[PDB]
Curated annotation (Swiss-Prot), chain A:
Modified residues (Phosphoserine): 82
Species annotation: Mus musculus
Gene Ontology, cellular component aspect: cytosol; nuclear replication fork; nucleus; protein-containing complex; RNA polymerase II transcription regulator complex
Entry EC no(s): 2.1.1.319
Tissue: Ubiquitously expressed. Within the brain, present in proliferating cells from lateral ventricular zone and dentate gyrus (at protein level).
Gene this protein is translated from: Carm1
Protein residues bound to S-adenosyl-L-methionine: 25, 34, 58, 80, 109, 137
Residues of the full protein shown: 136 to 477 of 608
Result after altering residue 38 to A: Reduces protein methyltransferase activity
Alphabetized UniProt keyword annotations: Chromatin regulator, Chromosome, Cytoplasm, Isopeptide bond, Methylation, Methyltransferase, Nucleus, Phosphoprotein, S-adenosyl-L-methionine, Transcription, Transcription regulation, Transferase, Ubl conjugation
Protein name per its UniProtKB record: Histone-arginine methyltransferase CARM1
Length: 342, 343, 343, 343
């Protein structure tokens, strides 16, 4: 299947074992913003579901299937690759919905569905949206979608903005300074300081923050899931040009994302922006190894490049430059292994 | 190899990737208890190391090799399976020790050493001592040990004790009761309440605790690494009989361990007992599904059975009964995925 | 002369230029602790001055000579090498003391005095006591001292103790990190990162601090000016052994000093200890380039080595080691060019 | 050499020791105004640099040379007299520019250069522009300049303006009045009050100020470095006639400067005016001994005379007169030792 072609067995096993735990399902579900927003999107666009065939990709506990059933769907095919699939059917039976919700265990890239569907629903967003590479399974599932079909979510917006946070930068450097020691119990570790600094700064920082640290209006990169193809997500190049509102040191880039459910009756947005209520996604920040000084009015231009790897994630290379001075900074990040600071 | 037959590749890859991070080496190294005690054990027993051949199993950063070098070792073969090895060779060079420390990348079950060694050193202990199943690699390495060779650590003590902690026990039901509601956004989740409970009780709890929660003197099970074989660690049966010091409800068993370095000059102990300073191992507690009432003076008898799995960990089966009342309780735990509760 | 042989002309010119300013005399004089403490020492030991011949080395404005005159000295020879000598004579005249205070312009190593003296007074202390190397001029002056004569101050005590201050350390590391930039306006500065760190950490930090940052009771090094010779101050080796009271990171050593005026009537102390009221000397701290971790009970041993240079100051070499672990740290500091952190 | 004949060795030693510190290079480089403006001037006039020979006088770290290299210079001779030169060559190698940048240690008046150059670049400006007397080294370098060559900066403007700051003027007497007391610890200091006053008024004040204290449009004296000779800078006579915008007491003159880079493509200005963002040069103020009252519309006429001394600085003589009143005031200052008042 296309899934095994793009994934190390080691990672996939780990991935689906993680999602096999009810405690994780609980964590996801107790996010009122996430769960409530999904329900609002489905129910207020109920006409897009009424008496229709639905495909739910990565149903987990099955919550989204139930929303679709509440909206009046004729039949929901709920596909789930973890052992959660067995718990889902238990809920379907105890909620008397066996005539309407059909759980199909397996990967959407590997299962056979009885028929094409009118709409696909899913929650494929990870940290920075793209983490876990579930967006490609979501787009793969489009093979079962009718020409006149819809997708929930319909589009995705990545938001980038430069930030200043001296406290965060010093925190990571305080940790790396361990490896600068000339005599730790009589051992010289200093030969590895270079390696240590790189590794710590290779960590995306997951947490929330006050928006006053943002130094410029954010830049947006939009993905339309209805027209996009699987191949489009192997290499994502996000160019940016910021016009600085404040003078100071830029310590990195901040990331968050919006998704929109564009239904017939109305459009519902789900945002993880720092101006919005917190979600289990929080926000993501990537530190530069060396800060860049920029005056207000200067322009900070560069590229954020995401290249998919076989561990179900992306390698992030960020290059940034102050156009007036030529001061340039780089960083390479491993999105798979973040630093949770909350 | 002997390693690949007892480990799923999936688990092994994730395992060695974890140990390839300098941040992880740093966490271990900043444990003064662990690192300080090892140095003390080696340096205070310099006679066991001076002009000897040494094998360091899972050297990681190589810290233990350097200690052996400080103690006067003739040659140290440092074996490391993760990408930490490439970093180890760097430190050996920058510390001018290439003539004495030889880094050998690979798994100890798969590499070939040029010669037999006088002593083997290592830090193979995981949670509850046995977690990660590295102890089997440590014992495997004995194929390279000369007769009359020594091992650092030399012996291991697992300790079991019954405890009472009403809040820990009740916490598990507060969490699972999330699933006991008839309309979560219009959905009846109650059907999964049972499974949720089961899931939470299969998790060993990692954290520390006040020694006053202990209901009896601990029972210890000893592994002597000098006589032990790999096969001895696939099935570990720890029978126990506790004589209760306090009356109350027993909610589970607490585990910790000691290791001893037995050298010519002296014996050095490394303990993770709750009476001792805290380590990155902390302590481990396993809850019973149902608490047992025990009088002071009553006897709590039963068995703790550890069965190794191919995910580099153990399945724990605990059954206990109060002999005077016949009240019986059991539990099954998966040590591979504990609940880190410390705060 | 002995002064020109131990001093660069470039440094000497700037040095005596500095003390030629009335604004600097004012700063010294407005140190109530210093000036008041000196007056207490001289007047309360007035019997050591009554009808005696006095030599005041580096009188500056002449303030100590006036103290001596108040105490009843028959005659005071006041030696001053800067142009301040011209101002001193103005005060001597406007205060009608020409019969008792005689200003001698020149360096104490070069002037000729009519007679031997009973007591020498002076303020030869700089930062960390030894900076400015005036103590050698003070000791040189003993050639004019009678066999049974006295010296004010009589003895000096240097105190050193380890401290912890994460914020001070990161401040200096933050400053040096400028040179780690890979593209400053398109230029790679990283090649100088090493040189930058060295330069910044070579600076002793002058400021005050909370005594709670000290990690152990201080060690004392005493200089007795009555028996000491100049040659003793060219190389000062201060060994130390601290018994750690608290566990934590040691970021450096803190220095302060006491001097004592031991007269016939009583002993008066002048202290720049952080437990005492502040002076224009403040305290001095020397950072290690890399901190050392020590538990409470461990011992921190090492050496502070002071070597006098031709710029009228000292080069400081500090080596420290945690005896139990072997963790070692060093640093070289240039006392002549401090970092003033004071508010 | 031409440099040694106009400088006492004592000052020269101290001068080049100062610029040998990376900490000061950093201080200069972190001035965005200075460094940014220089880069703008060089890169936006790239046609003045592409494939030409450049001479960089007092390159320090070499930053300006790297800019010239970015603009496309074929070869840059970078001259540096301090020990910074060794650091410069290190950067040249690590930035892989050894084929184009040649670092020449030594004074520009003493070194040997192989060839004539197309353009000279440098940042020779001190406080009040002329301080440090490096502008004379900049002009000396024209012996290596081809006719029709260019100079970056090309011209320099010093700006003069009258100001009012009653608190600054009164501050000097508050400080000097320390000496006006009949019993400081029993000593009458009053005889030195006059000397103290004189000393404070000879110090030009370095800091910044609000432009609302300025009493008239500034008067400017221009130095065009392309036709100017070294000899033009030994005696600078700046006559001035201010037309007062405000009525009030004038306490002195404020100084700042502009330099312009006149290239083929465009002209770039670097200004230290108080209306502009602050720089590490700040502004300079020189007090009159007695304030002068001037009505708005009145004319304040006089002369500012700068006379070079052997301490690499200037003696400033200011004479001013209110033409309508005949009210006259003067002052003589030593720019070598300013008073840093900032914050
Ligand atoms: N939001 C995450 C949920 O979606 C499930 N999932 C991830 N990849 C999948 C896939 N390729 N096929 C079916 N379900 C998948 C995954 O098992 C988890 O339950
Ligand atoms: N202290 C933990 C260290 O021991 C290493 N390790 C575990 N099993 C190993 C094995 N079988 N061969 C070599 N190194 C091993 C493991 O890679 C880690 O670096
Ligand atoms: N305590 C410092 C004061 O004493 C003066 N001084 C420093 N070294 C001296 C010296 N070697 N001879 C005479 N006076 C000296 C120095 O000029 C200053 O005024
Ligand atoms: N911008 C300040 C830089 O200019 C250097 N400098 C001053 N006078 C010099 C001189 N005469 N020759 C070479 N470099 C000189 C001075 O050493 C410093 O590095």
């Amino acid at each position: 299947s296309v899934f095994s072609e793009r994934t190390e067995e080691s990672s996939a096993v780990q991935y689906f074992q993680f999602y096999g735990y009810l405690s994780q399902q609980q964590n996801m579900m107790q996010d009122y913003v996430r769960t409530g927003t999904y329900q609002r999107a489905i129910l207020q666009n109920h006409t897009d579901f009424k008496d229709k065939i639905v495909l739910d990709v990565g149903c987990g506990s099955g919550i989204l299937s139930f929303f679709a059933a509440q909206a009046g769907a004729r039949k929901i095919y709920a596909v789930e690759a973890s052992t959660m699939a067995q718990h889902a059917e238990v809920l379907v039976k105890s909620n008397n919905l066996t005539d309407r919700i059909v759980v199909i265990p397996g990967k959407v890239e590997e299962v056979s569905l009885p028929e094409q569907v009118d709409i696909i629903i899913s929650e494929p967003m990870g940290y920075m949206l793209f983490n876990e590479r579930m967006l490609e399974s979501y787009l793969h599932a489009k093979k079962y979608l009718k020409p006149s079909g819809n997708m929930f979510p319909t589009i995705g917006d990545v938001h980038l903005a430069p930030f200043t946070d001296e406290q965060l930068y010093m925190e990571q450097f305080t940790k790396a300074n361990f490896w600068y020691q000339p005599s730790f119990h009589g051992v010289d570790l200093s030969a590895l300081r270079g390696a240590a600094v790189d590794e710590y700064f290779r960590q995306p920082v997951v947490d929330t923050f006050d928006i006053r640290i943002l130094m410029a209006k954010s830049v947006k990169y939009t993905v339309n899931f209805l027209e996009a193809k699987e191949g489009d997500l192997h290499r994502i190049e996000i160019p940016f040009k910021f016009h600085m509102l404040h003078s100071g040191l830029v310590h990195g880039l901040a990331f968050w994302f919006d998704v929109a459910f564009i239904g017939s009756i109305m459009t519902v947005w789900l945002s993880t922006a720092p101006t919005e209520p917190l979600t289990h996604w929080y926000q993501v920040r990537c530190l530069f190894q060396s800060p860049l000084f920029a005056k207000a009015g200067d322009t900070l231009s560069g590229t954020c490049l995401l290249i998919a790897n076989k561990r179900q994630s992306y390698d992030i290379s960020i290059v940034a430059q102050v156009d007036q001075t030529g001061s340039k900074s780089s960083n390479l990040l491993d999105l798979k292994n973040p630093f949770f600071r909350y």
